[PDB]
Write a protein that binds this ligand. Structure first.
Ligand code: HEM
Ligand code: HEM
Ligand SMILES: Cc1cc(N)nc(CCc2cc(F)cc(CC[C@@H]3CCCN3)c2)c1
Ligand SMILES: Cc1cc(N)nc(CCc2cc(F)cc(CC[C@@H]3CCCN3)c2)c1
Ligand SMILES: C[C@H](O)[C@H](O)[C@H]1CNc2nc(N)[nH]c(=O)c2N1
Ligand SMILES: C[C@H](O)[C@H](O)[C@H]1CNc2nc(N)[nH]c(=O)c2N1
Ligand SMILES: [Zn+2]
Lengths: 420, 414
């Protein structure tokens, strides 16, 4: 079966056959589309769902078939020997270890398969750091520091992922309790207002309970809370000289610097789960570089985040009485101009949403031609401002789940059995 | 099976049971989501005697429930009467009350429509007695004048006779009652609206005398009883237009932009209780972004971004100056400002999406849900600063419904 997608701006039609290799489920049915559900059950991974031999060798075999195909060795003796070796290791030890080459392939293809990621043109240039020999939270801290230094590269950002030991019985998990490696604290005040990043209040409170001495400012970089081998997590402070930040100023508005805004340069997601051949890597922080709107639209202008639209619109002296003045849209553009101006001026890698979406369309067409498709989630790919003046708005997309993959997992403070 | 949707800005959670009453199909499966396909086969559209009575029964069931007469004598009598009429005539006719209910509920069920908070105030014009294209023209002029109301726009639909054997179809060939012509210039580009180049051709290539201008109101091409379609010019005094100026940039007027007040979709199919109304033009009032973002700034449409930005003297060397985004906001300020100045009804995308969230809350509370298509509900600019961006939505197909149908010129047995 073949499936066509049309770009309604250019009339380019592409044909998807890759969806036939889709294994996991979407959450939709013929009678209901769940395409706007944020974290459906099919995109998450409960740690209690630890796999049996029963289901593991078919997942391994399918991964290894894909791997050996990509290296033009399908059906070779190396291929058959590896299948044999993995089979014996499973029935004997109930799990198996990936080779270094397989791990690198797996992590690159999990990103390649991430249908919500607009930055996938870069997928083949991922630096994979093998941390599967790590045993303690202190060792995790050291690996994460090296990831941050490497990825940051003094502003010339480089994509990277660090992969800690895989899940065994779900009782000895490695977890990074931070949602991102670098994030600002948030503090609920007694008067109900929030200081700092409202999205991080709950995690900030955990850190404080675990002994963090909170500066209680608006942009305090959170400590790392790291869990090795299923033990209680431990606190660590990232060396501040490793945390690259950018003060936000506007190229025309001199008062903008006086808002006191900054952001960090390195977006590094650390709470997702990497699935490769049925193995589950519960700690696998990865990082790239920012698209401007992630900071300028969502981080700064979501009502439930720093929420700076009013103050910016006040200082611009826009007509704030009626929404039809579009004072919110005007301030939004100026804030996003400032984010991009500030990063470029400091020579920190950033991409604007016009550039990123145009590159994604080129990536997607290439993937149709060389791979037979490119799974893509329109709801997430379209940028959160100026949607229809980017080319992805007009692009039909097919969403399906391929493995290897990144999955969501429950926050560990909800599942952890505390040792004390 | 009893599903929940969450708003991530407010944490409000709603429970949906209405989807269990879904009848048509989405195009998705458990292995693939087609949520961003413009026109799956299901959203496009002869009925045999067999499929028609269950459809009629389902519709009459929900109608008599809505008036609290489910299981009443009147209900059962109507069921058998339509049953008798289908067995006999191979179709049936709706009572006026059922027609009005069916139309309002087709709008209520339109999961892609952000304006549905207004669904119950729709003015239904019964045109089922119409027999000719001149009669269709008369009915449409009356609709346009009633709906326009000197700029105090009112929602309305006009329903022409239902499909019979599929050979006597009533169709409005225009996609909207009021749209601007488009012509392929000899110099290579496109004058007017590029979206309407084909239809503009079929007007000339059927008789129209085009002014070959940039904002020429297209004539109506009306098809009655399956005959050949006929041209009619809508009286200009009935077509309310708005010159587009900016409340700060005096040069804006020199761009020469205008738009019409009345958005009136004319090419969809209305399905009520199995019956098919192939000609059912309906109208409401614009959300500003429809004109300013899509009509004016789409690259396949009037595509004015570059010209506006040049007149603003923005740095167009690099995309990262966000000159497109700046111009886009100013264009959309001008649209709202112009309509508001001329006292023509318009809603901005902030007000409309806030209204839709309130509508969703009402529908979940009083109906058990509200089918909604996030890809279409979220506005084409400033998506995440509108509340619908953060609102999870369940998309499913309820009937009565509006459906797409093939363009007539591809189907007409000429
Ligand atoms: C290199 C530049 C990159 C850019 C510009 C980029 C951009 C984005 C953006 C804007 C999103 C939407 C998420 C949101 O709005 O919060 C996203 C999602 C995602 N990105 Fe990328 N990304 C990049 C690199 C990477 C890398 C290196 C990885 C992994 C190796 C990755 C994996 C993902 C995944 C898994 C998601 C999906 C999250 C979900 O399913 O909810 N990205 N990306
Ligand atoms: C009164 C104010 C109204 C507003 C502000 C409004 C707004 C919108 C918008 C912005 C869209 C998106 C489609 C596009 O971008 O081209 C839409 C779709 C739609 N509207 Fe409404 N509308 C209104 C009235 C009505 C009425 C009176 C009807 C029918 C009686 C209706 C039926 C529909 C349908 C069926 C669609 C979806 C077409 C599809 O499935 O692709 N609307 N509306
Ligand atoms: C690697 C990377 C690059 C880049 N430009 N941006 C990112 C962050 C995007 C991202 C990537 C990702 F994989 C997961 C998330 C979490 C999204 C949450 C879910 C609810 C609220 N938001 C976010 C990562
Ligand atoms: C009644 C009405 C009100 C309003 N504010 N806007 C409209 C027009 C919106 C609309 C409503 C509708 F039902 C159909 C269409 C045509 C869809 C095409 C196909 C892809 C691009 N557009 C458009 C109608
Ligand atoms: C409900 C809705 O799915 C949710 O708000 C989504 C919409 N699209 C998104 N797209 C991106 N890139 N990031 C997001 O967090 C979201 N949130
Ligand atoms: C391919 C994609 O579905 C297409 O561009 C859609 C996206 N969302 C839309 N949303 C609305 N309201 N109107 C549209 O025409 C579209 N076009
Ligand atoms: Zn779907």
């Amino acid at each position: 079966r073949f499936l066509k997608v049309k770009n309604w701006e250019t009339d380019v039609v592409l044909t998807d056959t890759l969806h036939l290799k889709s294994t996991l489920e979407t959450g939709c049915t013929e009678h209901i589309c769940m395409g706007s559900i944020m974290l459906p059950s099919q995109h998450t991974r409960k740690p209690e769902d630890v796999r049996t031999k029963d289901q593991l060798f078919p997942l391994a075999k399918e991964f290894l078939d894909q791997y050996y195909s990509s290296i033009k060795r399908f059906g070779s003796k190396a291929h058959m020997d590896r299948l044999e070796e993995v089979n014996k290791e499973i029935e004997s030890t109930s799990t198996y270890q990936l080779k270094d080459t397989e791990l690198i392939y797996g992590a690159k293809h999990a990103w390649r398969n991430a249908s919500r990621c607009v930055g996938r043109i870069q997928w083949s240039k991922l630096q994979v750091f093998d941390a599967r020999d790590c045993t303690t939270a202190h060792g995790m801290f050291n690996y994460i520091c090296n990831h941050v230094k490497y990825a940051t590269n003094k502003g010339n950002l480089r994509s990277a992922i660090t992969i800690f030991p895989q899940r065994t019985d779900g009782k000895h998990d490695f977890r990074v309790w931070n949602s991102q490696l670098i994030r600002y604290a948030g503090y609920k005040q007694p008067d109900g207002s929030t200081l700092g990043d409202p999205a991080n209040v709950q995690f900030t409170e955990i850190c404080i309970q675990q002994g963090w001495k909170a500066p209680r400012g608006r942009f305090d970089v959170l400590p790392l809370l790291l869990q090795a081998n299923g033990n209680d997590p431990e606190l660590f402070q990232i060396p501040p000289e490793l945390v690259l930040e950018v003060p936000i100023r506007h190229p025309k508005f001199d008062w903008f610097k006086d808002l006191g805004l900054k952001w960090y340069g390195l977006p590094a997601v650390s709470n997702m789960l990497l699935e490769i051949g049925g193995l589950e890597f519960s700690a696998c922080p990865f990082s790239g570089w920012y698209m401007g709107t992630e900071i300028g639209v969502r981080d700064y202008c979501d009502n439930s985040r720093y929420n700076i639209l009013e103050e910016v619109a006040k200082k611009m002296d826009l007509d704030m009485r009626k929404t039809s003045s579009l004072w919110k849209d005007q301030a939004l553009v100026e804030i996003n101009i400032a984010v991009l101006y500030s990063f470029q001026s400091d020579k920190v890698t950033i991409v604007d949403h016009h550039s990123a979406t145009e590159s994604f369309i080129k990536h997607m067409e290439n993937e149709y031609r060389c791979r037979g498709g490119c799974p893509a989630d329109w709801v997430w790919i379209v940028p959160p401002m100026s949607g229809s003046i980017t080319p992805v708005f007009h692009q039909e997309m097919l969403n399906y789940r391929l493995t290897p993959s990144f999955e969501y997992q429950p926050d560990p403070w909800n599942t952890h059995v505390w040792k004390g």
